[PDB]
Symmetry: D2
Subunit: 337 residues, 4 copies
């Protein structure tokens, strides 16, 4: 019964909507979308998708102010300035912020000035903004938080299994590297950008760039403060990525024992969040997986009894979006005013 | 000898600079560049290129207002609004307009307001603007023209051999299709765009889109008005494109006679503009060619004695830029004021 | 009810299996497969596919001589020489020849020697072999034919609408060009090949190459003998292709009249074979379509009243395979011995 | 004055020839090539290259038994069976084995039965075959070795800087991962292969596969026996790769100190073998670098004083080939019988 609004109808915004549509007995009601591109555009791009394929639902425009999905009508507005949105007039409870532009209190707060009661950022928050990762620390959320963050795709892949390792072996220190698919922040052909590396043609290069997933894990898992670091390598694939972690543990072990620890959690406290694959698969095989992290068992190695190396896959668009849905579900169940 | 300013340091802007740098005894002198990205950005992207390779010349930043190439210094400015540019102050003779946004008389004229003397648009002009194609109708240029156009890359490939075909056999009617490399106007991943086809992931699809080259040919070749039309298909390659033309002629002929007609021109009036290749090559082999169009002789066909089909290659970035330098040299040699 | 054997478990071989599996009440029964790669390899590549996605059915290896799909068991054999195959022993009725090496009577006949009853080649036959295209001339099939051909993917896309155009307007002459996805006959990196163009890196170039579809059309449509010719351009996409046809007709017409003629057929005699699309889509949107050809109505053009240009899409892997299943059903319904 | 023969004219074979051609005062003389593809093919693919570009030399066929480069004539033969090659008759001193098929004594020995005096394998040798890496242990080579190995591209990138780290900090143990461009061993489209992962479409996936560079380093650097391991990830780029190493050292240090150690060696004992780059570059920027390893300084990290992480680039085709040339040069200088 929570009235939800989506601000920014891009890759995550559209993946969010399709993820929600597939749920059963949802406590959420999507009633409005702010797409600065218009009604025709919103309808066309929701129906046709180069990554997910054609949406199996009857999608069409409704007048010049809305669209409909299998009969359910959804209002569409268009304004680049949040302060002018009709949130108060419509009675919006929660705003899904997926523009990538209003990631700080100053910006996200504009939605509050317009009347919305709460805001959820689909990315790391800038400054003193509460950050949560489902399966790791969501129990710390309270109805008093007016603005929250669901972290990044990379942090949602790491956090889960890093927690299992620290509790069953004790992490002393480590480092990680992620081979990530390209995103809209990169350039199609060599062009201007703050990051001189992200300025180079994306379908043609291996592009190194910084990452904050390192210290982001420390936020959701206090024990790991100042114990990890890392970088990222952007490659020529449209979706699906992988993380490579190497850590030093206090408890001597062996590869076969580490995989056992993972399978146990995936079957209990992390069922639906973590998974373990024992087949020789490739990136494309992990498209549309609802979990946020999948361990590639055959690649697990242990050198010198204490140096562990782990490899895990993750659908950065779809898997992350299922998590945004879960967090929004928590906001609903904890609502009191 | 002629003061030249470059407005817009993108793909065409940077290619133009390198094309000019390699010329011997040039009547042009580039003294300033307007890069709304920064002195270092212009410096970095000029030295390193994903398509042309590393620039063979010592490139460096000369302070916070200029850069250095093989010693020479070139000022760098940043201002999205042309009316406020120091053109009149620097005594600029010609401005190379390559931003892709100021194509009409009002927009382009703003350079004249800033104090510039003449403007040359690296794209099709809108409205009442004289268009020229070297080798087709450049002889009709006059120093009196304050604003001119060099047409599109596709038009520069078509015009040259269409002219030969009309003079030798007489064109009645025809149609065209260009399989073109992707450009900056397209999107890396499904995203908002006025053209619902160009909005789709460029490195993943074959994308049909409109083209104006057909009607543009009639501009430089009046006898062809109303005789041609066509379309374009954008594909997953970063540079180099190909044209496929089918026309019905008044004089019966055959494949080898058509090829020979093209060779006579390439050896005479169109030397340096048109070429004929007899080897079995592919697109990558035509990168960095100086001509505007190259006929693939073994693909030429004639059906029913009067329906001719021709296939021609062209480097849309480097080939077109060499023609920009050529048209600029004509302006310099025609200065009588 | 009909014993079918699959010789060659490649792209076409595996697509055929999945196409058949989805049919309702099939008169065919696949009992054996000849994969010179192994029982597990056939098992692994059948379940996981980079183009079709994960097969939705429980696939498993049934020993060292067969596999299991949704319970059913299918024998697996390995023998590069057909003459030594247990066809006669298993009482095989029809053999689906999809290796691409046995296309003539001698080569294909070896299946008859092994004891097979009939053979159907998933490619153009060489010499004196009857060729059929569903929707064009399948009515001319007879149980007496021991060896038949289903033509190429391009021919199956062209024939259907060329037939409509000839009956309605009368074709005098024409030319064609197909922008086709790359296939297994090409090379990943520059390497030895009889065709010096197909020897070049496939994911990096636009590659011109010969095609036989033009002359092949005359086989199924005798009235077109000597009226068409054409070429092909291979581009960097893994599947889905498009045809561009230009013809001169005897009866004057216009674009919308041509489109309407195609719609009448799609709604009647060619339902399930030909379709007409009025939306602004791209290649990825046509993946997994069951028809042989789809007209892109907004691209149709007519120059000088009698020169018609048509653009049509086709899934070269999945679309063609559905036609293989259709021709196999005809053989089953025509069995009179 | 060493008479050399090249067996297998693929990517490495052709890169080898162009590398040699560019040297000054070479002690080698290439007189014959075994290309099972023929004279026309050998001439065409040497002249045109999708990665290196057009060879700046006059290349053509000479009769039907040879080719010429800038006037120098080179004989061409074609036979898949080494025992039948005219090595003894021609007086061949050294054979460059780049087929990827005769990597063991049994196979490579066939060249010795045919008359050649020595053989050099352009890949890791199988079994008890002497292995060398220029800049690390070439001083151990002696004229008595009849068959030798130059190791793999990955080992030539690692070995060099691993040596600098162990001598100035002391390596206790470590692990590595290499993000490598695809090669001819992979499949263009999902097809049969021993490695079920290498069987999947290469321009479309991130493909994990095993590597032997781990224990290969121990061969050229005894101190590191049983101290390292690792894996590989194949991505959608045509050439140029990168290595990521993480090791535990006995001497506490910091990132800035590690880079200093590298710059020192690159300027002395490893000049021409190792390099250090301090700019924000991308993969394409390292094409055609003659060194075998380039450290990306800005990416160097140190966690907990003793856990070091290093990132280095390498042109797997060209850089490796320059090393094959150097090793062959050593064979010449140490020749005595
Ligand atoms: N892709 C992924 O893997 C993940 C992305 N994210 C984060 O989500 C955010 C968006 O990323 P993503 O969906 O990937 O990218 P997209 O560019 O696909 O989506 C961003 C959208 O914001 C729209 N937009 C920008 N400003 C406005 C505005 N002021 N008003 C209305 N619409 C606006 C853009 O429209 P326009 O087309 O005009 O640019 C674009 O459609 C970023 O914060 C990103 O870091 C987080 C996790 C995963
Ligand atoms: N690429 C090709 O093959 C050809 C392109 N053209 C034409 O050339 C033009 C540009 O195309 P292209 O080089 O491909 O594109 P690019 O985006 O590479 O270059 C255009 C540049 O204009 C800059 N820019 C935009 N507005 C301004 C402004 N108002 N003031 C200063 N700088 C500005 C843009 O900066 P920013 O990035 O900040 O937006 C961008 O750098 C178009 O007219 C195009 O049709 C013609 C022939 C060939
Ligand atoms: N791909 C497409 O779009 C279409 C292809 N076709 C045609 O179908 C045929 C095959 O093409 P395609 O599926 O694309 O190619 P694939 O290589 O994917 O399939 C061909 C298969 O034949 C197997 N094979 C070869 N010889 C034998 C043999 N003697 N005995 C047993 N198995 C053998 C090959 O095995 P191995 O890998 O060991 O060499 C390979 O697996 C060709 O005639 C092609 O023109 C027709 C329509 C569409
Ligand atoms: N590419 C790289 O990065 C490196 C490769 N290597 C090694 O070098 C070897 C070749 O690799 P690469 O050049 O990359 O691959 P290629 O396939 O490009 O080269 C191998 C060549 O061997 C030819 N060939 C195979 N058998 C014979 C034969 N019996 N007689 C004559 N010619 C034959 C093949 O011809 P055909 O076309 O008929 O297949 C092919 O042209 C392998 O051992 C590989 O591991 C080592 C370092 C680097």
């Amino acid at each position: 019964k929570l009235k939800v609004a989506i601000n920014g109808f891009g890759r995550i915004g559209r993946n969010f909507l399709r993820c929600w549509h597939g749920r059963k007995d949802s406590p959420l009601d999507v009633v409005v979308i702010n797409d600065t591109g218009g009604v025709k555009q919103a309808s066309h791009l929701l129906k046709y998708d180069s990554i997910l394929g054609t949406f199996d639902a009857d999608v069409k425009t409704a007048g010049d102010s809305a669209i409909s999905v299998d009969g359910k009508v959804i209002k569409v507005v268009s304004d680049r300035n949040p302060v002018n949105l009709p949130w108060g007039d419509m009675g919006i409870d929660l705003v899904i912020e997926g523009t990538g532009v209003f990631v700080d209190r100053d910006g996200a707060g504009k939605h509050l000035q317009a009347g919305a009661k709460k805001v959820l950022i689909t990315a790391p928050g800038k400054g003193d903004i509460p950050t949560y990762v489902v399966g790791v620390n969501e129990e710390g959320y309270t109805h008093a938080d007016t603005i929250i963050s669901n972290a990044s795709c990379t942090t949602n892949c790491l956090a889960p299994f890093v927690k299992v390792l620290d509790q069953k072996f004790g992490i002393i220190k480590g480092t990680m590297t992620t081979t990530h698919s390209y995103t809209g922040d990169q350039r199609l052909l060599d062009a201007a950008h703050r990051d001189l590396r992200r300025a180079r043609a994306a379908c043609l290069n291996i592009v190194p760039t910084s990452t904050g997933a390192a210290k982001a894990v420390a936020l959701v898992l206090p024990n790991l403060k100042g114990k990890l670091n890392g970088i990222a390598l952007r490659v020529p694939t449209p979706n699906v990525s992988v993380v490579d972690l190497v850590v030093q543990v206090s408890k001597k072990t062996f590869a076969e024992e580490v995989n056992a620890a993972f399978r146990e959690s995936a079957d209990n406290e992390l069922k639906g969040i973590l998974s373990v694959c024992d087949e020789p698969l490739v990136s494309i095989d992990f498209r549309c997986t609802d979990v946020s992290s999948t361990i590639d068992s055959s690649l697990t190695m242990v050198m010198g009894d204490d140096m562990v190396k782990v490899i895990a896959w993750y659908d950065n668009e779809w898997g992350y979006s299922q998590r945004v849905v879960d967090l929004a579900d928590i906001v609903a169940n904890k609502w009191q005013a």
